């Protein structure tokens, strides 16, 4: 494990405790939100997020901080502003930037 990877390792578990009903916690699926595949092109969530950091694909906090605002705008993009799913998204994008600032 590299000094990066547990960098990121300890902002993903602040990230994921800000999301306690586990929406973001695994890829959407087209049976829980019809159509989703063919709308999101790049699909992310907080257990692909894991999987890369182990796998030692981000190579920098801003490649990190980049697929966590993917996720986020990928939920703004397919649900409308007055349901949980994208309530949430717009509070944690705000929150997690700011957390992975101080
Ligand atoms: C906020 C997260 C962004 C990703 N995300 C996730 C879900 C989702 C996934 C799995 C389970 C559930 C869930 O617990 N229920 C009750 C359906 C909801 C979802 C559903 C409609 N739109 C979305 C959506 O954009």
Redesign the pocket.
Same mark, same amino acid.
């Given at each position: 494990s590299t000094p990066i990877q547990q960098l990121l390792e300890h902002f993903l578990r602040q990230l994921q405790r800000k999301d306690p009903?586990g929406?973001?916690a695994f890829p959407?699926t087209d049976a829980? !939100?019809p159509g989703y595949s063919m709308i999101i092109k790049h699909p992310m969530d907080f257990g692909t997020m894991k999987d890369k950091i182990v796998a030692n694909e981000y190579k920098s906090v801003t490649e990190f901080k980049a697929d966590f605002k993917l996720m986020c705008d990928n !939920?703004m993009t397919?649900?409308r502003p007055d349901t949980v799913?994208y309530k949430?998204?717009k509070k944690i994008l705000h929150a997690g930037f700011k957390m992975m600032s101080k």
């Open positions: 009903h929406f973001f959407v829980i !939100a !939920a397919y649900n799913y949430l998204a």
